[PDB]
């Protein structure tokens, strides 16, 4: 019973076409210098750069209603720190070490899809596990996951295989938040597929 209002409606609507996906996809003008946005926003490729973590934001920031998008991040392309979430327009997108960049500061919120941990203003040790009752060593986030941002309640949560896993972060009302990830893997290809909005 934890779903945002209108999530089933949204996920059952005809999927946004490639045009819509590019409009709400990764921004070539808002990513790390070590990331190349391809296909007009449908995916990015992180260049091979040693001792760097690199982020990207979507083109569109959300302040109201419900928005969802699918991230596709091959399991073998995640490396030591693969973080999926949202950021304000001001979050840093690059740092010179391997780290959970997304969620390391005030401006970002991330789920570590290898460790299972949630980061916001967090360096990483002690961070809580998500979803409830799981732990890294005994879960595996598959290639595709949905990111679900409810800007009426002010929550960010995730869905896997069509199933919402609950609110991960709260307290987001009044912000303007963009899709975001941070990555460390040379030549990783991270795709984003916008699923639409309601509200």
């Amino acid at each position: 019973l934890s779903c945002p209002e209108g999530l089933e409606e949204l996920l059952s609507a005809p999927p946004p076409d490639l045009g819509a996906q590019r409009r709400h996809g990764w921004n070539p003008k808002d990513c790390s210098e070590n990331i190349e946005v391809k296909e007009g926003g449908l995916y990015f490729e992180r260049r091979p750069v040693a001792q760097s973590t690199d982020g990207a934001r979507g083109k569109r920031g959300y302040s109201r209603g419900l928005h969802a998008w699918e991230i596709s991040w091959p399991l073998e392309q995640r490396g030591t720190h693969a973080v999926v979430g949202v950021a304000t327009a001001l979050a840093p997108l690059q740092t010179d070490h391997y780290a959970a960049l997304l969620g390391s500061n005030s401006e970002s919120w991330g789920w570590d899809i290898g460790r299972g941990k949630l980061y916001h203003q967090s360096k990483g040790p002690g961070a809580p596990q998500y979803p409830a009752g799981t732990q890294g060593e005994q879960l595996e986030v598959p290639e595709r996951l949905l990111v679900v941002l409810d800007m009426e309640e002010g929550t960010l949560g995730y869905a896997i295989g069509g199933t919402y896993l609950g609110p991960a972060f709260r307290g987001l009302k009044g912000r303007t938040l963009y899709p975001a990830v941070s990555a460390v893997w040379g030549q990783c290809q991270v795709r984003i597929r916008y699923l639409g909005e309601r509200g």
């Binding site: 091979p48 750069v49 040693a50 001792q51 760097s52 392309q77 490396g79 030591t80 391997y98 460390v184 893997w185 040379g186 030549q187 990783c188």
Partner: peptide, 8 residues
């Protein structure tokens, strides 16, 4: 080459 994260 040699790096944990496929960077070289």
């Amino acid at each position: 080459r040699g790096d944990i994260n496929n960077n070289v």
